[PDB]
Amino acid sequence: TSMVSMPLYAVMYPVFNELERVNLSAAQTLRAAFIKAEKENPGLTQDIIMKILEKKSVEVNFTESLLRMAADDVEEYMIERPEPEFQDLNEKARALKQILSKIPDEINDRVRFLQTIKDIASAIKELLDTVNNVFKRALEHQKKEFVKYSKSFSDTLKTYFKDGKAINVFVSANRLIHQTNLILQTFKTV
């Protein structure tokens, strides 16, 4: 399935998946309509969510919460192929996303944050090795993009340790997560 914006697949997709049990047809309809409307007007889903939370008086920092929600698997980007390499790709992608999502819970404590950063580095190189291993075109381009976002995330870490703005780190981590999902989706659709 197509690559969509993070609010859609990280916030709404699980909601659609849960509505499956209630009524499959209605869930599929809502899902498809959401995808189409998001495609027509990018950022629609985020605005819908924000205005809904606003009207229900639910106060949150949406980028941080998005970072936490982005940990979950996106079923449509998961490779169904049984071969070990692809399942390993799913696993490494998942690991990186999971460790990146731990940032908001850890960033205030310097020690635990540094440990988290170490784990992030480890996950990144693991996913890199797996990606380069699977190579048996656009794939290489997505790999280079992934590396670029990794580097950018590191620079963001430096800048944070300079000025102390957490939001930039959250945004960068979200970017890296999205690029990971993009890697998997690209591998899946070729």
Partner: protein, 66 residues
């Protein structure tokens, strides 16, 4: 019989957003199709929109902290 959120949430929000994109991007057909998709879903299964809102709020609250 139907969901409460249809008039209290879906309608005003989608109105605001419809006007937001109609006077910028230009295409609002799919947006209106989504708003209507809430209605079709409600007709196929009464209460499912409320359940959608509940699941949304549950999800954002589970992954929000301080």
């Amino acid at each position: 019989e139907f969901s409460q959120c249809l008039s209290t949430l879906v309608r005003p929000v989608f109105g605001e957003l419809k006007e937001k994109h109609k006077q910028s991007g230009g295409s609002v057909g799919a947006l209106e199709e989504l708003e209507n998709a809430f209605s079709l879903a409600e007709e196929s299964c009464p209460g499912i929109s409320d359940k959608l809102m509940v699941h949304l709020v549950e999800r954002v609250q589970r992954f929000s902290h301080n």
